[PDB]
Write a protein that binds this ligand. Structure first.
Ligand SMILES: CO[C@@H]1O[C@H](COS(=O)(=O)O)[C@@H](O)[C@H](O[C@@H]2O[C@H](CO)[C@H](O)[C@H](O)[C@H]2O)[C@H]1NC(C)=O
Ligand SMILES: CO[C@@H]1O[C@H](COS(=O)(=O)O)[C@@H](O)[C@H](O[C@@H]2O[C@H](CO)[C@H](O)[C@H](O)[C@H]2O)[C@H]1NC(C)=O
Lengths: 131, 131
């Protein structure tokens, strides 16, 4: 899927991503960080993948190494609909805001100066990105 | 500037880009093609740069080699302002359209199946990209 680099997204600046969730979607991924080996956020809604169903999986990747996975109890995505996610960070957490009012936090484990890299993958057709 | 890859923009599909032209803008660049060495369009408004004044320069790049520059009289860009373009291509031309109705056309020299790559450079900050 789409890969964007040189984002230079600073603490407090908002990255917005709107896409279409495939009607038979199994999974999609938004990766954010410095590059493919250094992700401050791996955001992975799983509809029906890796033994999971309707679960948001989050993790980090630091110098190629996956961190400790975290999951949310809520799943505000529907196959066959448009979804928007808005991401920002401070030194402590990433804050991910989702459609139906939902907002959660994921610990900032890498302390990058900026989010420079985003990559999308899976069953999510990106329609627009706002920086 | 922002670099985006795995665009899979087909003929007819519209790439919409909105960005901020720096207040002291000397020139800016939007590159489109397969990758950084294979550009079906290098779109380069020069406010005052390389000996040009308020002239758009367009070119292609094929296997790392610049083609022949096309230039225009019409120059609807202003420093320190927001610029919106809509880009598309077909068999014949690339087209760059501005909201007010200006259309720039540049011949399609590479004849690629899709635009997969976009890059901004110079005094232009991309704020929003849509497909
Ligand atoms: C060691 O197996 C790993 O288990 C994780 C826990 O979930 S479970 O369903 O297996 O019990 C899996 O999520 C994990 O899958 C990987 O998870 C990372 C993010 O943590 C990312 O989504 C990868 O794409 C995904 O494969 C699984 N195996 C690994 C580490 O690949
Ligand atoms: C062959 O040198 C090139 O001269 C062009 C002007 O020629 S002139 O006869 O009108 O004076 C310059 O446009 C050109 O600048 C380069 O142009 C490409 C697109 O064709 C791109 O914009 C580069 O960023 C720009 O440097 C110049 N070539 C150079 C400087 O190598």
């Amino acid at each position: 899927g789409l890969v964007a680099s040189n984002l230079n997204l600073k603490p407090g600046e908002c990255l917005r991503v709107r896409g279409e969730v495939a009607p038979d979607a199994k999974s999609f991924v938004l990766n954010l960080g410095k590059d493919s080996n250094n992700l401050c956020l791996h955001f992975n809604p799983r509809f029906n993948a890796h033994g999971d169903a309707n679960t948001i999986v989050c993790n980090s990747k630091d110098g190629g190494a996956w961190g400790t996975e975290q999951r949310e109890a809520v799943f505000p995505f529907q196959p066959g609909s448009v979804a928007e996610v808005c991401i920002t960070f401070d030194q402590a957490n990433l804050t991910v805001k989702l459609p139906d009012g939902y907002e959660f936090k994921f610990p900032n484990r890498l302390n990058l100066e900026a989010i420079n890299y985003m990559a999308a993958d899976g069953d999510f057709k990106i329609k627009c990105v706002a920086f």
